[PDB]
Write a protein that binds this ligand. Structure first.
Ligand SMILES: Nc1ncnc2c1ncn2[C@@H]1O[C@H](COP(=O)(O)OP(=O)(O)OP(=O)(O)O)[C@@H](O)[C@H]1O
Ligand SMILES: Nc1ncnc2c1ncn2[C@@H]1O[C@H](COP(=O)(O)OP(=O)(O)OP(=O)(O)O)[C@@H](O)[C@H]1O
Ligand SMILES: Nc1ncnc2c1ncn2[C@@H]1O[C@H](COP(=O)(O)OP(=O)(O)O)[C@@H](O)[C@H]1O
Ligand SMILES: [Mg+2]
Ligand SMILES: [Mg+2]
Ligand SMILES: [Mg+2]
Lengths: 523, 365, 487, 200, 46, 166
């Protein structure tokens, strides 16, 4: 009736965030990749992970907490079990460490589980709306997919992922919790302040109710930074194995590799390319293979991965960057030049790809995306090599891809359809955003009293699901859709563009410039 | 309270460069502990060591803050009972200090109320600030493209002789002199003459009133100093700023020049410690060292610290691990290009490669 | 020490995926398989393969599963031989792993024989000369780099250029109607891709669960440890060898990706006490790959048509691994990212591809002549492109300007929509016959279609489809003219 | 090697006595004696048994005399296992070893629980741990029971510091009366905020 | 041409230096991790 | 009666009667989704009857959860459920499913969605329950009398510089 632990040896040497243990003669011994407790006091313990088992009997330990309290000669107890962390709906809206400890703000899941079997998966057929027209159209993302986000520093890699998490808040509030998308945001090696700013940003939009944060700041040891992705996905596997869908964001795997390299070198592991350990590919490989779309027989849950990766001078020939690209099912390449050129998000469509394809798009978006793709392809080639229709609409599509916040599906799809069917041909490229703002956030037909539609109005937000069911090019919705667009185009051109083209005063010119720039950041 | 290891006696067992192994019969003291060499050794100055690793239950590896000349094996060493502590409070204002906290201005004793360890834990999540505002420097390029944030972190990446030091002096003149709060100048692996020029400048401007109240503290470990000192002067200078932020709730400016030398110093000792080098040749713990240091440089709910750090880019290679890792730890980044300077354009800021976090309409107009 | 079956040893060292085992009676022979009989509370069995002998008693080994929960001195029992995999027609329509255990959850498999995964490659006297064209239904491959039956084919490409898509098209075009059997080896690739392949094969009736299947699947993927990914290729190859020799059948062997086999060995090489080599690859890169490749060959007993996908890291064809694989192939298909970015699929660079059967003796004289003319025209068109960049198209002489117009049509006419990429392209695929391709290109070279619009050759099949697309283009253009006329 | 040599003669306590003499002698030897050591010339080691003396020369040849302690512990473990003795380590605070009555009871209870050590004879070995100020701990065959406690004057806050009064801008209901008075109402809000910041 | 040649040359020299350092670093680690057993020789034989 | 098989050929449980009873005993319609989740986990794919019961619970339930949820809409949940059934399960909604949607639109006063659902039933199904069509028209004409035909801010006249772009 005693709480007898399993002492296995003493602490021999300490080198920064790692340590070595010497086993006491005639002791049970510790198992590989298990958790151990270093008795820093008769009541206080420091967590460590077994990493090496040498011929001499010495044990390599990766420290996780209370490192400053660790001293040579202290006792070590072996729990004899792998790493398990709390998992469940009770962790949502909280900030936690890779070990599960909650971080104050101003069920147990195993962290080393195997990926689903080949026959345990199903084809990706459910879309995951990021809220950005460029991605949702040209770079479809489906639930259970791994979509890399590769770019240079200060290019929107973090903002886009956060916006994707936020975009699910409105959807989750309406649809049943069965189809709600939970979010696991993992911050690795980032500043503590950035985590706090992200936490406040999510709280403002109410995303904490469906989101949890796992933070391993820079000040924390490399071990926590090394385990954060595995702990984060483990929290997301709880929902996957119970018929629910989750979205895991890693910000970012680049710093995880550095932590793994730091651990391996200190523990006398042979270095490899760029001093990284030989088994660095296998690290990320088993991390991203755990994100899948389970088959109907296992529940139908899924985990969607959005790992983030940083490059130097737009060099995608690096070691870890290449490895991650060869693993994910698609990549979003954020280009520095486009970012400074005013294109935001700076998604380089030419270098970006989604291997899932149209299967990860809603029936409504398939038709728009397919036709849009051809126009842009021609538009890129025409300018590279004359007001042709592909060139007239291609520029307006590019202008519509500038965004600052995620867009509701109904607003985005309608705007793309209008530009696709030539409704914006008479609209100048500079005024496209202003045209979109009036279409979404006001109604010109009602204002000028010419609206004869019965149900189809942009202020009826419930039409999003009807559109997502029947498609825009259906008799139920097509007839009124064209009428609304025709009225909006005629009213916009007559009452707004004519006055805008007639402005010469410096005061009026400056006022117009502020308006159009604001419209970019509004819709 | 009193440490249980104070007065512990050890003997030198191995000497290699600035790295020394000490064997204690009763047990190696805790890591980061400070030790003093008692044997005369015919040295001209005292010898102090800081523990950084534990080789076994009795042997510990340490880095010397002074030169290890005339150091023999079996030399006697005594533990000080704690980490390296430095003076804090208003008594330090108007004074010059070194890595060990000893005044080097050849003036009266500091008479500090108390001392605090250089090594300390960083502020936690709940102790972080959420205030964004523009610090007007008077420079067109900075104020327009990459505006600085009050209480934020600013980095000036540049090569050799590009203008990093000049911009810092301009910022000091345009901000520090007309600053209500306090200021701390941390010289790390930089020219000793520059510190003297700054000290004269601060006296002429009467920011240091030798007979009155001063608003500036100087902490200098320069190029001539051994690697051990250059790897800890930043900690000591940061510690003084932390007292003002926390125990006085006072706004602080922290001018560090140059932060790159800190990483360089840790690289030199790491090679001697017997660690496998990372890419280029830097220590494998490059990121962790910066993270621990930078995370302490932040504005909490008690006070604010506006930090300006000069970063030296070796061989003008911005992809070097040292400067590359520092980008993620800065709110504002100011990149200087040699070619721009050669065209007669000063400052040589490359606006395309510069960035700021407060470049948001929600913050700026 | 002849029969080591049941020999006992103890685990002495565990570092990553490499484990050292001590035997009091002497270490078993290299490549021997060992089972961890000790009860360590693991959810999966642990098996090791001996790779080295440190001394007369100690042996280094690579684990096939994760080494979690493994303690020192743990008991280990030899299996009496190398890793064995089931063989025979009973494996058809089934999915296996590196260890030869079914993972399809479709019940026990009736195995009458098992064979070791490690075998000696055929000797020189066991080489068969088979020079016969293989019609894949693809204009580019059938024309410039025709494939040979019983030969070796490599698909060198980067990431996202279409290596996997081409393999799917080849399976759809060559495997459905294949007389013999097929073996697909997934090696260090995405698990979902294997799932999609399994569904497609069942739909295409290649794998008939109720009836008779004609293909086997062997999967060791990214999630698996390096030990598994370094032997899954041997396991599948062993199955194909049995079909070649014992069954005397003509078998297809698809491998995706062969590079992962090299990558896995490099990962474990560091822990085996081997100093790294150029680009951080193991010093044994050339020899290890050679032994595996030589086993993949057609002998006097049967024939193996091998199609292997090679990943070129960062599109660097100068890297050790892609270069080492070029000398072990009969037909190389090099894919270029630039071609794909221009909308041309498959993104094949004909100037870098090669084929062994591109000789008049093997193929028809017309086929040989047409292919050479196409290559020369493409080569010339590149030089004219540079002058276009500096001077402008108008400045080019009339003869050169004709080569430009014809060459551009050739570039677009090489593109072809595949039947498996309908979702990607949104259009039905085409299967172009060998004769149609030769005739279509022959007429194009001599200017028989100089008046046809250039875009009529983009993403189409034979010449007939070109004419139909030109007619459709003319009709829509006329409608646009009529609309403009009314305005 | 020592265990094998002693097993032939059948006496193991001689080696233990030799280690005790070595430990006593080492306490008087100069610092770092293991690196200039010459066991042949040292008179203290002249009284050791042949197996121990041979091993010491064996270590001195390889320069591994620094492992004398570890070699002794490994030997003592072998002797106890051969003699069927189970040693329980009782970790106690410095000077707190006077009372070990509870430690013996705990050790016996642990011994009873262990089935392997049913035939082994219980022995108690006291160890001094400076990490515990009160209580004791017992370790036996890896089973560790802790019944000990360890240790349980900065400036807490700035009395001068005061949290600034966070102002809130008054919000008026959006009626027509507000639009007509928009400028006037805005001025009142600005005045209110100015008063709050300054105080009056 | 002169400028590109200069950068081409600086790269080739660095590539040679970088690769060799990498290989040497992995050779040193094995040397550092090399274990010497007890010299089972006749020390009294001398 | 006839065994069903999944995508990979494995059989699926078809006895979905107990789950329907569980669905018909829920208080808040969000709990119904949990039952559907359990059915999928147990390899018991829902049939057309199960979805209709879920729609009935949504229509008859007071609210989504015990505590109010911002921007909760019964119509959105049911339409999403139908989208899942038709697209991700390959099951054609019957007349019963659409009638539940029309009833919710009439009950909630959303007279514009009723028009769209009315056409859907008149297009896919055979007409609409004339009781519900008349009820929707009554709601629409009530808005005309009270003036709540469109949100008022839309009717406000604006200009090029008279629009506040947030
Ligand atoms: N769509 C956008 N439109 C306008 N500004 C944007 C957009 N996305 C991001 N930004 C801004 O660009 C800057 C960089 O964004 P972000 O923090 O996402 O970059 P990042 O990829 O995470 O870079 P790093 O983390 O290395 O700093 C921020 O000021 C952010 O507000
Ligand atoms: N703003 C400036 N205007 C004019 N000249 C400048 C300016 N900044 C720098 N220079 C010139 O460049 C020289 C070097 O500047 P500075 O002392 O700032 O170098 P640095 O960036 O600190 O480099 P390092 O400290 O490594 O020598 C100055 O002596 C001066 O000649
Ligand atoms: N025939 C094709 N037509 C159109 N796109 C293609 C084709 N083949 C490949 N792709 C592109 O490549 C993607 C598939 O890449 P994949 O075959 O997996 O290449 P790899 O294995 O070399 O990385 C598709 O999603 C599409 O973007
Ligand atoms: Mg970021
Ligand atoms: Mg300088
Ligand atoms: Mg592929």
């Amino acid at each position: 009736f005693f709480k007898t632990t399993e002492m296995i040896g003493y602490v021999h040497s300490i080198d920064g965030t790692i340590a070595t243990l010497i086993p006491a003669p005639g002791n049970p011994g510790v198992a590989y990749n298990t958790i151990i407790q270093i008795q820093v006091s008769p009541t206080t313990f420091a967590a460590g992970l077994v990493f090496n088992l040498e011929k001499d009997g010495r044990i390599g330990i990766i420290l996780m907490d209370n490192i400053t309290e660790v001293q040579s000669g202290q006792k070590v107890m072996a729990t004899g079990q792998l790493l398990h962390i709390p998992v469940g709906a009770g962790v949502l809206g909280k900030v936690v460490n890779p070990l599960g400890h909650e971080v104050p703000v101003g069920t147990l899941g195993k962290v080393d589980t195997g990926a689903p079997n080949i026959v345990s998966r199903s084809p990706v057929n459910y879309n995951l709306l990021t809220g950005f027209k460029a991605v949702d159209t040209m770079i479809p993302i489906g639930r259970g997919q791994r979509e890399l986000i590769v770019g240079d520093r200060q290019t929107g890699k973090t903002s886009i992922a956060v916006s994707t998490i936020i975009n699910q808040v409105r959807i989750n509030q309406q649809i049943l919790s069965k189809n709600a998308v939970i979010s696991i945001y993992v911050s690795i090696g980032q500043r503590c302040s950035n985590v706090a700013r992200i936490h406040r940003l999510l709280q403002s939009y109410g995303a904490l109710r469906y989101t949890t944060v796992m933070a391993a700041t820079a000040a924390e040891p490399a071990g926590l930074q090394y385990l954060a992705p595995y702990a984060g996905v483990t929290m997301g596997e709880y929902f996957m194995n119970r018929g629910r869908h989750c979205l895991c964001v890693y910000d970012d795997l680049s710093k995880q590799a550095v932590a793994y390299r730091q651990i391996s070198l200190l523990l006398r592991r042979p270095p490899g390319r760029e001093a990284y350990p030989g088994d660095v590919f296998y690290l990320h490989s088993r991390l991203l293979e755990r994100a899948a779309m389970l088959s109907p027989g296992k529940g139908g849950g899924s985990v969607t991965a959005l790992p983030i990766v940083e490059t130097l001078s737009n060099d995608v020939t690096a070691y870890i960057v290449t490895n991650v690209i060869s693993i994910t099912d698609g990549q979003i390449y954020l280009d520095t030049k486009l970012f400074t050129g005013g294109q935001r998000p700076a998604v380089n469509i030419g270098l970006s790809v989604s291997r899932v394809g149209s299967s990860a798009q809603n029936a409504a978006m398939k038709g728009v995306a397919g036709k849009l793709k051809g126009i842009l392809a021609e538009y890129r080639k025409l300018a590279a090599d004359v007001q042709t229709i592909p060139m007239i609409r291609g520029a307006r599509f590019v202008a519509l891809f500038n965004q600052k916040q995620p867009s509701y599906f109904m607003n985005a799809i309608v705007s793309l359809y209008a530009c696709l069917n030539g409704y914006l041909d008479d609209v100048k490229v500079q005024y496209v955003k202003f045209y979109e703002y009036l279409l979404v956030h006001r109604d010109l037909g009602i204002m000028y009293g010419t609206a004869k539609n019965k149900f189809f109005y942009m202020y009826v937000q419930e039409l999003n699901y009807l559109i997502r069911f029947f498609t825009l090019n259906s008799p139920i919705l097509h007839g009124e859709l064209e009428e609304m667009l025709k009225q909006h185009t005629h009213l916009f051109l007559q009452h707004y563009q004519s006055k805008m083209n007639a402005i010469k005063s410096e005061k009026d010119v400056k006022a117009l410039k502020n308006l159009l720039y604001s419209c970019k950041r509004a819709v | 309270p009193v440490a249980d290891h104070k007065g512990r006696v050890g003997h030198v067992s191995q000497v290699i460069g600035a790295v020394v192994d000490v064997h204690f019969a009763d047990g190696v003291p805790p890591v980061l502990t400070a030790l003093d060499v008692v044997d005369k050794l015919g040295r001209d100055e005292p010898l102090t060591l800081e523990i950084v690793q534990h080789l076994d239950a009795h042997t510990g590896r340490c880095i010397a803050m002074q030169t290890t000349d005339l150091l023999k094996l079996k030399a006697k060493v005594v533990s000080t009972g704690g980490n390296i502590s430095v003076p804090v409070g208003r008594e330090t204002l108007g004074r010059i200090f070194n890595v060990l906290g000893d005044a080097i201005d050849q003036r009266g004793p500091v008479g500090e109320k108390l001392r605090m360890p250089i090594h300390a834990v960083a502020p936690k999540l709940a102790d972080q600030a959420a205030e964004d505002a523009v610090l007007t420097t008077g420079i067109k390029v900075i104020d327009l493209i990459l505006p600085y944030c009050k209480g934020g972190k600013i980095g000036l990446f540049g090569g050799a002789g590009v203008g990093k030091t000049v911009i810092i002096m301009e910022l000091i003149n345009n901000v520090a002199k007309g600053h209500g709060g306090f200021s701390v100048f941390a010289g790390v692996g930089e020219r000793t003459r520059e510190g003297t020029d700054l000290y004269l400048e601060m006296m002429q401007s009467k920011v240091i009133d030798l007979k009155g109240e001063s608003k500036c503290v100087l902490v200098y470990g320069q190029m001539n100093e051994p690697p051990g000192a250059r790897a800890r002067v930043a900690q000591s200078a940061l510690t003084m700023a932390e007292y003002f932020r926390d125990v006085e709730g006072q706004d602080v400016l922290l001018f560090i020049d140059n932060i790159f030398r800190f990483t360089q110093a840790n690289s030199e000792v790491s090679a001697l410690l017997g660690r496998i080098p990372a890419a280029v040749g830097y220590q494998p713990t490059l990121a962790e060292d910066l993270g621990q240091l930078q995370e302490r440089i932040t504005s909490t709910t008690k006070g604010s610290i506006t930090s300006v750090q000069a970063v030296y880019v070796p061989a003008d290679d911005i992809t070097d691990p040292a400067p590359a890792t520092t980008f993620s730890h800065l709110d504002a980044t100011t990149v200087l290009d040699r070619a721009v300077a050669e065209s007669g354009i000063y400052p040589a800021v490359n606006p395309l490669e510069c960035a700021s976090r407060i470049m948001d309409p929600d913050v700026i107009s | 020490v002849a029969d080591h079956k049941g020999r006992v040893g103890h685990v002495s060292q565990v570092i990553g995926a490499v484990v050292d085992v001590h035997f009091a009676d002497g270490v078993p022979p290299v490549l021997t398989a060992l089972d961890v009989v000790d009860k360590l509370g693991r959810d999966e069995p642990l098996t090791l393969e001996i790779v080295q002998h440190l001394d007369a008693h100690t042996g280094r080994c690579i684990a096939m599963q994760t080494t979690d929960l493994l303690k020192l001195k743990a008991k280990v029992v030899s299996t009496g031989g190398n890793i064995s995999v089931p063989v025979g027609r009973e494996t058809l329509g089934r999915i296996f792993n590196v260890l030869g255990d079914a993972i399809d959850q479709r019940g026990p498999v009736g195995e009458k024989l098992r064979m070791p995964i490690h075998a000696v490659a055929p000797k020189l006297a066991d080489q068969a000369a088979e020079d016969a064209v293989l019609t894949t239904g693809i204009k580019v491959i059938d024309l410039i780099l025709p494939y040979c039956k019983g030969g070796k084919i490599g698909l060198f490409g980067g990431a996202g250029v279409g290596k996997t898509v081409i393999i799917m098209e080849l399976i759809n075009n060559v495997a459905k109607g294949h007389g013999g059997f097929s073996v697909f080896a997934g090696v260090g690739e995405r698990t979902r891709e294997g799932t999609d392949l399994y569904l497609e094969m069942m739909q295409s009736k290649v794998i008939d669960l109720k009836g008779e299947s004609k293909c086997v699947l062997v999967y060791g993927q990214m999630n698996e440890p390096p030990g598994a990914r370094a032997r899954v290729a041997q396991s599948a190859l062993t199955m194909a060898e049995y079909f070649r020799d014992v069954e005397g059948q003509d078998v297809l062997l698809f491998i995706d990706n062969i590079f992962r086999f090299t990558q896995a060995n490099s990962e474990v090489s560091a822990l085996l006490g081997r100093i790294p080599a150029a680009v951080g690859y193991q010093p044994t890169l050339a020899e290890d790959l050679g032994q595996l490749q030589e086993r993949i060959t057609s002998t006097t007993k049967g024939s193996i048509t091998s199609v292997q996908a090679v990943y070129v890291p960062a599109d660097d064809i100068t890297d050790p691994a892609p270069a080492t694989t070029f000398s072990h192939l009969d037909a190389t298909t090099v894919l270029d990212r630039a071609v794909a970015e221009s909308g041309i699929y498959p993104a094949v660079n004909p100037l870098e591809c090669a084929s062994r059967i591109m000789d008049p003796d093997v193929i028809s004289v017309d086929h040989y002549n047409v292919a050479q003319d196409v290559v020369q025209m493409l080569t010339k068109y590149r030089e004219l492109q540079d002058i276009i960049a500096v001077l402008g198209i108008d400045e080019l002489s009339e003869e050169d300007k004709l080569i430009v117009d014809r060459a551009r049509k050739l570039v677009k006419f090489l593109s072809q929509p595949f039947q498996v990429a309908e979702v990607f392209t949104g259009m039905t695929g085409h299967y172009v016959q060998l004769d149609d391709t030769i005739d279509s290109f022959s007429g194009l070279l001599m200017g028989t279609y100089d008046q046809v619009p250039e875009m009529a050759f983009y993403m189409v099949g034979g010449i007939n489809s070109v004419l139909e697309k030109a007619k459709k283009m003319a009709e829509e253009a006329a409608e646009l003219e009529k609309m403009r006329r009314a305005r | 090697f020592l265990y094998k040599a002693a097993e032939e003669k059948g006496n193991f306590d001689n080696i233990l006595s030799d280690f005790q003499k070595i430990a006593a002698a080492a306490s008087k030897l100069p610092i770092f004696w293991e690196r200039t050591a010459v066991v042949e010339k040292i008179p203290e080691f002249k009284q050791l048994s042949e197996p121990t003396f041979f091993t010491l020369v064996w270590m001195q040849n390889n320069g591994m005399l620094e492992l004398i302690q570890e070699v002794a512990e490994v030997y003592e473990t072998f002797v106890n296992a051969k003699q069927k003795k189970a040693v329980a380590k009782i970790f106690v605070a410095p000077g707190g070893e006077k009372n070990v009555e509870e430690a013996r009871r705990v050790a016996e209870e642990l011994h009873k629980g262990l089935k392997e050590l049913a035939d082994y004879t219980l022995v108690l070995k006291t160890v001094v741990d400076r990490t515990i100020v009160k209580g004791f701990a017992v370790e036996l065959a890896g089973q560790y029971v802790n019944k000990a406690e360890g240790q349980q004057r900065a400036d807490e806050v700035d009395y001068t510091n005061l949290p600034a009064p966070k102002p809130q801008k008054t919000v008026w209901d959006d009626n027509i009366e507000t639009e007509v008075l928009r400028k006037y109402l805005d001025g009142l809000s600005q005045y209110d905020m100015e008063e709050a910041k300054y105080g009056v | 041409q002169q400028r590109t040649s200069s950068l081409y040359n600086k790269t080739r020299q660095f590539g040679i230096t970088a690769a060799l350092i990498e290989i040497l670093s992995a050779m040193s680690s094995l040397e550092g991790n090399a274990m010497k057993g007890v010299r089972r020789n006749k020390f009294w034989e001398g | 009666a006839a065994k069903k098989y999944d995508l990979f050929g494995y059989e699926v449980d078809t006895n979905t009667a107990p789950w329907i009873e569980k669905i018909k005993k829920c208080k808040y319609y969000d709990e119904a989704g949990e039952v559907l989740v359990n059915m999928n986990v147990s390899n018991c794919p829902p049939d057309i009857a199960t979805y209709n019961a879920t729609l009935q619970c949504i229509y008859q339930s007071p609210s989504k959860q015990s505590t109010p949820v911002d921007n909760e809409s019964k119509f959105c949940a049911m339409m999403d459920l139908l989208e899942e059934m038709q697209h991700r399960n390959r099951l054609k909604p019957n007349e019963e499913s659409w009638t539940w949607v029309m009833k919710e639109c009439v009950k909630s006063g959303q007279f514009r969605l009723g028009y769209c659902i009315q056409q859907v039933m008149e297009t896919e199904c055979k007409g609409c329950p004339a009781d519900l069509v008349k009820a929707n028209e009554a709601n629409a004409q009530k808005a005309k009398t009270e003036g709540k035909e469109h949100p008022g801010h839309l009717s406000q006249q604006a200009g090029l510089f008279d629009v506040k772009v947030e």
